[PDB]
Amino acid sequence: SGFRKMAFPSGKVEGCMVQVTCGTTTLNGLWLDDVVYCPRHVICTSEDMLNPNYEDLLIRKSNHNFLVQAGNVQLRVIGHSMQNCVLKLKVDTANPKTPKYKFVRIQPGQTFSVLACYNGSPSGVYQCAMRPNFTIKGSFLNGSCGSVGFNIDYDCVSFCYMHHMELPTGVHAGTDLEGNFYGPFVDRQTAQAAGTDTTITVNVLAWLYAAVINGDRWFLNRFTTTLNDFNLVAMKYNYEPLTQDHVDILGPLSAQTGIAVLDMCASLKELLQNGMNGRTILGSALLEDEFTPFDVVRQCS
């Protein structure tokens, strides 16, 4: 028993992290087979970051401009190209630790593990959720660009995030591994900022189910509500709307506990309207929305 925010074991990804240096700019890259993936902004300095033309900047580079280091061993770059906001550097050695992998793009409200790296060296691992406004609330210091986010399913690593930049509010923005940004952000210095965010309702409900499974029941009540009346309270408190597909995804948890989804929605309505009155749920005094129904099932089998 117990319920903890848990990352995937990171070993399969640790074996893929390298350091990429271009000029005086160093950051992290992802070495899969004979290709290294990294943020394209490794090819410019701060003067270019104000208004960069990356097609121009890349044409002015050669293979020998890129230093790739996997631990001690320097990897020889034999080709370079750009795919959207990611740079692909072909190297003359296939990574012998390449896991089975896929490049997948995730949806807002889904979670993934982040392996924070500096200078190609992993430093820590933690879970993130993609917020509805396409930012993540991570922990990234200078040098962490190119750190990746991933999920693991039966020894296949699904890479979903590469870190590119920090926004003024301290949240983080990046791309999928095809180089396409999550959200309306760009890899240049503008006044860009995170848009308004909302709470992921289906995840809050999943976490209330986790709490019941772990013996927290004080917030339960005899009432039920309709989907429609619940959603009127959702909008008032800046929660995302709940759909029938959400109800269906919550099915297995509702079955394991015996509490119908719309029964739990009544509890959430009262928590939103009255607060907690000094009590806690799974050790939180706030309603937590960064656990998916899948995350809960994984720990509550």
Added chain:
Amino acid sequence: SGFRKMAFPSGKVEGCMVQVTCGTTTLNGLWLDDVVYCPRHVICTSEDMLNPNYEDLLIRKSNHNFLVQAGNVQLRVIGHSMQNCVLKLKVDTANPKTPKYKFVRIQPGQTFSVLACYNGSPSGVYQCAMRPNFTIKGSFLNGSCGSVGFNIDYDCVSFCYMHHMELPTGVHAGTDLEGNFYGPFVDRQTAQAAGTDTTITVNVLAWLYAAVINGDRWFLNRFTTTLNDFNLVAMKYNYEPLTQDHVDILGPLSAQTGIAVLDMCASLKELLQNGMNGRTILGSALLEDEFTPFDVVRQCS
């Protein structure tokens, strides 16, 4: 920027996890060089767990009674012995992925990463603090015994915890890797329960410093307090006493922020006496005590 509960990258430990089976009991073991370490209660069934004599039970076993599996490869057991509550199984193959390691015992209030495993297969990684009552608030399902806790310092893994059992309140108890339990617990079925716990004051203060570093300042005030008057409020709210050594450990954080330790103690006193009034600190509505001063410095450089 940002501040997140972060585990150490787990790859070095993943390469050491094996499955140990004895009869119908299977759990996790730790394979370092040519020795496998696991909880000794793998050698008994439920009838023995009520009042086991482990010296008797081990004398009745032979090497061929132990099945050790590292992935697919079965490891041949050529020796067995008991050290306190851990079983040591000598095998005929040295683990080629053995990292540099040490066996260290940690202090209450210190943190470590847990690699949750099932059937020798890692499933997730998360941070834990050793509570003052020598329990941890982990996430462990059936089959997770023998999962280990560790810290990493410059590619040396310091193993500090092996998981043995769950207590009635849902918290967890285990041993160091020499087999010596943390706290007053035993590996048999008694009515044992966690003792009263307290809040780790130095860690709460470290986390308030993290918050200031990340731009949370609303709880600061112009006041200072003495160590003695602070400690009178500590006892009232079930906080551990603060010592001069604690003040010294908080030195670097106090220097980076410009807020003297006893200045921050005044803020903690007011947070304890008045609450938060609907505000949050680093996204928590509760005061968090599972980050050490070291954990904070690691993310706030």
